[PDB]
Design a protein around this ligand. Structure first.
Ligand SMILES: Nc1ncnc2c1ncn2[C@@H]1O[C@H](COP(=O)(O)OP(=O)(O)O)[C@@H](O)[C@H]1O
Lengths: 50, 51
């Protein structure tokens, strides 16, 4: 979700950030990450590394 | 000094250890620009996917 998909998978779509950059159309927006405290820290690929 | 003797370049491993924030990482890059080798950081803290 933070990095999209390979684009070789069926139905892959770019990660969320590219969408925000596409939408605000500026190179330097003010992203607001939310709820860092509760990141799902699982075996399924740790976002905290991401 | 040893690389200067036995001809060609050679690799070797090393380890540093000590309290955080002593500058370990800073010296890494400084050495890389000393020998003229290229630098590349690679964290592996807490990783588990060997792939
Ligand atoms: N004795 C020192 N000589 C040069 N830089 C130092 C020294 N002590 C602290 N630093 C500074 O400490 C900072 C962090 O060092 P570094 O090893 O990159 O991160 P960390 O210390 O968290 O491992 C660097 O900006 C570095 O310049």
């Amino acid at each position: 979700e933070i990095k999209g998909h390979r684009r070789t998978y069926v139905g892959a779509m770019p990660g969320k950030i590219i969408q925000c950059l596409k939408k605000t159309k500026t190179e330097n927006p003010l992203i607001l990450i939310d709820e860092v405290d509760k990141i799902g820290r699982g075996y399924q690929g740790d976002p905290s590394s991401a | 000094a040893v690389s200067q003797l036995r001809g060609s370049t050679q690799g070797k491993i090393l380890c540093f250890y000590g309290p955080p924030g002593v500058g370990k990482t800073s010296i890494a890059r400084s050495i890389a620009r000393a020998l003229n080798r290229e630098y590349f950081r690679f964290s592996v803290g807490g990783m588990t996917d060997v792939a």
